[PDB]
Design an enzyme around this catalytic site. Structure first.
Site, PDB file in Angstrom:
ATOM      1  N   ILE A  19      21.809  19.289 -20.250  1.00 46.04           N
ATOM      2  CA  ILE A  19      21.963  18.599 -18.970  1.00 46.04           C
ATOM      3  C   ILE A  19      23.424  18.318 -18.606  1.00 46.04           C
ATOM      4  CG2 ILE A  19      19.630  17.622 -18.935  1.00 46.04           C
ATOM      5  CD1 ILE A  19      20.988  14.913 -19.777  1.00 46.04           C
ATOM      6  N   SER A  20      24.319  18.414 -19.584  1.00 45.66           N
ATOM      7  CA  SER A  20      25.737  18.177 -19.329  1.00 45.66           C
ATOM      8  C   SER A  20      26.608  18.782 -20.431  1.00 45.66           C
ATOM      9  CB  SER A  20      26.010  16.676 -19.178  1.00 45.66           C
ATOM     10  OG  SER A  20      27.304  16.433 -18.653  1.00 45.66           O
ATOM     11  N   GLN A  21      27.733  19.380 -20.041  1.00 43.68           N
ATOM     12  CA  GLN A  21      28.618  20.042 -20.998  1.00 43.68           C
ATOM     13  C   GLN A  21      30.070  19.602 -20.833  1.00 43.68           C
ATOM     14  N   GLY A  22      30.893  19.922 -21.827  1.00 49.51           N
ATOM     15  CA  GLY A  22      32.300  19.565 -21.803  1.00 49.51           C
ATOM     16  C   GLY A  22      33.148  20.500 -22.646  1.00 49.51           C
ATOM     17  N   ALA A  23      31.344  18.566 -26.184  1.00 45.00           N
ATOM     18  CA  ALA A  23      30.449  17.410 -26.143  1.00 45.00           C
ATOM     19  C   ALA A  23      29.285  17.631 -25.170  1.00 45.00           C
ATOM     20  CB  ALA A  23      31.227  16.148 -25.776  1.00 45.00           C
ATOM     21  N   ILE A  24      28.232  18.279 -25.668  1.00 42.71           N
ATOM     22  CA  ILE A  24      27.085  18.671 -24.859  1.00 42.71           C
ATOM     23  C   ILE A  24      25.916  17.691 -24.984  1.00 42.71           C
ATOM     24  CG2 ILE A  24      25.435  20.515 -24.371  1.00 42.71           C
ATOM     25  N   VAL A  25      25.279  17.395 -23.859  1.00 37.22           N
ATOM     26  CA  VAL A  25      24.122  16.512 -23.844  1.00 37.22           C
ATOM     27  C   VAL A  25      22.861  17.305 -23.492  1.00 37.22           C
ATOM     28  CG1 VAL A  25      23.083  14.448 -22.827  1.00 37.22           C
ATOM     29  CG2 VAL A  25      25.574  14.575 -23.154  1.00 37.22           C
ATOM     30  N   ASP A 140      34.716   3.254 -19.955  1.00 33.64           N
ATOM     31  CA  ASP A 140      34.532   4.306 -18.959  1.00 33.64           C
ATOM     32  C   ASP A 140      33.460   3.869 -17.971  1.00 33.64           C
ATOM     33  OD1 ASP A 140      34.954   6.748 -17.695  1.00 33.64           O
ATOM     34  OD2 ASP A 140      33.423   7.777 -18.889  1.00 33.64           O
TER      35      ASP A 140
HETATM   36  N1  LIG Z   1      20.453   7.496 -22.604  1.00 41.06           N
HETATM   37  C1  LIG Z   1      20.495   8.358 -21.621  1.00 41.06           C
HETATM   38  N2  LIG Z   1      19.488   8.505 -20.787  1.00 41.06           N
HETATM   39  C2  LIG Z   1      19.527   9.379 -19.797  1.00 41.06           C
HETATM   40  N3  LIG Z   1      20.564  10.149 -19.556  1.00 41.06           N
HETATM   41  C3  LIG Z   1      21.661  10.098 -20.313  1.00 41.06           C
HETATM   42  C4  LIG Z   1      21.685   9.158 -21.407  1.00 41.06           C
HETATM   43  N4  LIG Z   1      22.860   9.267 -21.993  1.00 41.06           N
HETATM   44  C5  LIG Z   1      23.524  10.211 -21.332  1.00 41.06           C
HETATM   45  N5  LIG Z   1      22.825  10.701 -20.333  1.00 41.06           N
HETATM   46  C6  LIG Z   1      23.272  11.728 -19.380  1.00 41.06           C
HETATM   47  O1  LIG Z   1      24.379  12.447 -19.861  1.00 41.06           O
HETATM   48  C7  LIG Z   1      25.517  12.260 -19.045  1.00 41.06           C
HETATM   49  C8  LIG Z   1      26.763  12.070 -19.891  1.00 41.06           C
HETATM   50  O2  LIG Z   1      27.338  13.344 -20.083  1.00 41.06           O
HETATM   51  P1  LIG Z   1      28.863  13.822 -20.343  1.00 41.06           P
HETATM   52  O3  LIG Z   1      29.739  13.587 -19.170  1.00 41.06           O
HETATM   53  O4  LIG Z   1      28.744  15.239 -20.795  1.00 41.06           O
HETATM   54  O5  LIG Z   1      29.400  13.069 -21.581  1.00 41.06           O
HETATM   55  P2  LIG Z   1      29.976  11.634 -21.455  1.00 41.06           P
HETATM   56  O6  LIG Z   1      28.654  11.066 -21.890  1.00 41.06           O
HETATM   57  O7  LIG Z   1      31.144  11.668 -22.366  1.00 41.06           O
HETATM   58  O8  LIG Z   1      30.361  11.280 -20.061  1.00 41.06           O
HETATM   59  C9  LIG Z   1      25.227  11.038 -18.214  1.00 41.06           C
HETATM   60  O9  LIG Z   1      25.761  11.120 -16.932  1.00 41.06           O
HETATM   61  C10 LIG Z   1      23.739  11.004 -18.134  1.00 41.06           C
HETATM   62  O10 LIG Z   1      23.335  11.684 -16.978  1.00 41.06           O
HETATM   63 MG   LIG Z   2      26.662  11.075 -21.825  1.00 42.18          MG
END
Ligand SMILES: Nc1ncnc2c1ncn2[C@@H]1O[C@H](COP(=O)(O)OP(=O)(O)O)[C@@H](O)[C@H]1O
Ligand SMILES: [Mg+2]
Lengths: 238, 177
Positions: A19-22, A23-25, A140
């Site tokens: 769902i998000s990349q950079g 440190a991937i979520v 942040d």
């Molecule tokens: N506990 C959570 N529940 C739902 N979404 C989350 C959660 N933690 C993180 N996310 C999602 O991941 C994103 C964070 O991603 P990212 O920018 O890659 O790393 P950082 O977390 O360093 O900002 C958040 O904007 C959110 O959308």
């Molecule tokens: Mg995050």
């Protein structure tokens, strides 16, 4: 690449969706250790970072503080850089997006003068107030790092992303946290941005005013610094 | 009894069983070396989530860090603990001479299927007591919140509304090492 290493570490047993990349979520429907069908939620978050230790320790500490709303720390592998978290929030109706504060505000930006919006934003300020009262800093504090969890017709603000968080009793850290959020909200250029910030600050102040005379003193200290930070945050001819 | 797997570790099965009205805890402890199982004090275990989180931590530690103890069974007793001292963990989380309930845990590393009938036969030859289902309903009977708060060093200010809330704090402590 990163997807390769992660899926190999987790094995094919664990479904993942980036769902998000950079440190991937990622999100996953698989609980990291409860037997299948013995868990209690549809999905979870996996944060991979080849800050991991920091965010985990802080999530654990903040959960124990009455009133503070943060995601559950489900699992931690500090050796490989994985943390599994409770998934907070949901998709707003009508394609308005994931229910972070930023998206909520955009969705209501044409008609923000409602009990729902004001009450929700005050609750956001309460969370930050609780955080600062207890001498923690977020690091942040953007509108993307505040997640709204549905509670019937109400919303319950939670704080996420504590990678840059810290323990701190310094009013300078507190002021910068507030200033980062203030500027993030102002960044939309919405005609209502100042009102949003005012509602947030009302929530913040209430938390301090609930702590008697000591609260009132500490609040004066924080607000004084916050105004200095605002002053120092804009161009001045030195 | 339940036989389970941690998703990222498909080849390792863990069996868990819960006994009440246990009569021979002193005898079990005396024979422990020379039996392999871990015998865990349910007064310190409030939920499946807590127990499984320790099993997870055990496998992570052994695979990617270092095993401190003799085998996976003992390592898991350590991982249930909030601290690094092995003896303290064995003492506080292991059964006691006066234990009237116990959790019987065993890691099965053979890729083969667990022989459940033999396993039940072995457990009942060791434990003089009555097996009940390993589930949250039965675990909620036997945990001692006061003892848990003391051992996991939880503040009186922390006031979870339910067992899920308490469990979350224990998982936190387990996951943080
Ligand atoms: N506990 C959570 N529940 C739902 N979404 C989350 C959660 N933690 C993180 N996310 C999602 O991941 C994103 C964070 O991603 P990212 O920018 O890659 O790393 P950082 O977390 O360093 O900002 C958040 O904007 C959110 O959308
Ligand atoms: Mg995050």
């Amino acid at each position: 690449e990163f997807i390769d290493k992660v899926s190999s570490y987790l094995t094919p047993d664990v479904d993942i969706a980036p769902i998000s990349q950079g440190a991937i979520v990622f999100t996953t429907t698989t609980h990291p250790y409860l037997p299948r069908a013995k868990d209690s939620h549809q999905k979870y978050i996996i944060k991979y970072r080849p800050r991991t230790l920091n965010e985990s320790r802080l999530l654990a500490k903040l959960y124990l503080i009455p009133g503070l709303c943060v995601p559950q720390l489900i699992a931690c592998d500090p050796y490989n850089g994985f943390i599994w978290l409770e998934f907070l929030g949901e998709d707003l109706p009508g394609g308005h997006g994931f229910s972070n504060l930023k998206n909520f505000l955009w969705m209501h930006d044409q008609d923000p003068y409602s009990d729902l919006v004001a009450t929700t934003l005050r609750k956001v300020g309460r969370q930050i107030g609780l955080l600062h009262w207890n001498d923690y800093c977020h690091g942040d504090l953007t509108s993307s790092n505040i997640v709204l969890v549905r509670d019937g017709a109400r919303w319950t603000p939670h704080l996420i992303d504590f990678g840059l968080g810290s323990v701190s009793n310094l009013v300078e850290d507190k002021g910068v946290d507030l200033y980062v959020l203030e500027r993030a909200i102002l960044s939309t250029h919405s005609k209502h941005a100042e009102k949003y910030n005012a509602w947030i600050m009302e929530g913040f102040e209430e938390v301090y005013r609930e702590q008697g005379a000591k609260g009132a003193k500490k609040l004066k200290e924080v607000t004084k610094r916050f105004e200095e930070v605002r002053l120092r945050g804009r161009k001045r001819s030195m | 009894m339940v036989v389970s797997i941690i998703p990222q570790f498909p080849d390792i099965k863990v069996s868990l069983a819960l006994f009440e009205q246990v009569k021979n805890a002193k005898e079990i402890r005396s024979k422990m070396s020379e039996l392999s199982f871990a015998f865990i004090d349910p007064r310190l275990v409030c939920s499946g989530e807590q127990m499984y989180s320790a099993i997870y931590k055990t496998l992570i530690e052994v695979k990617y860090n270092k095993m401190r103890t003799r085998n996976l069974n003992s390592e898991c007793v350590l991982c249930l603990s909030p601290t690094s001292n092995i003896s303290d963990a064995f003492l506080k989380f292991g059964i006691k001479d006066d234990s009237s309930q116990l959790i019987c845990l065993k890691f099965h590393t053979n890729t083969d299927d667990v022989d459940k009938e033999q396993l039940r036969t072995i457990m009942t030859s060791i434990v003089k007591g009555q097996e009940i289902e390993f589930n949250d309903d039965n675990l909620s009977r036997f945990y001692d919140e006061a003892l848990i708060r003391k051992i996991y060093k939880l503040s009186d200010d922390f006031k979870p509304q339910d067992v899920n809330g308490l469990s979350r704090a224990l998982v936190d402590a387990i996951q943080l090492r």
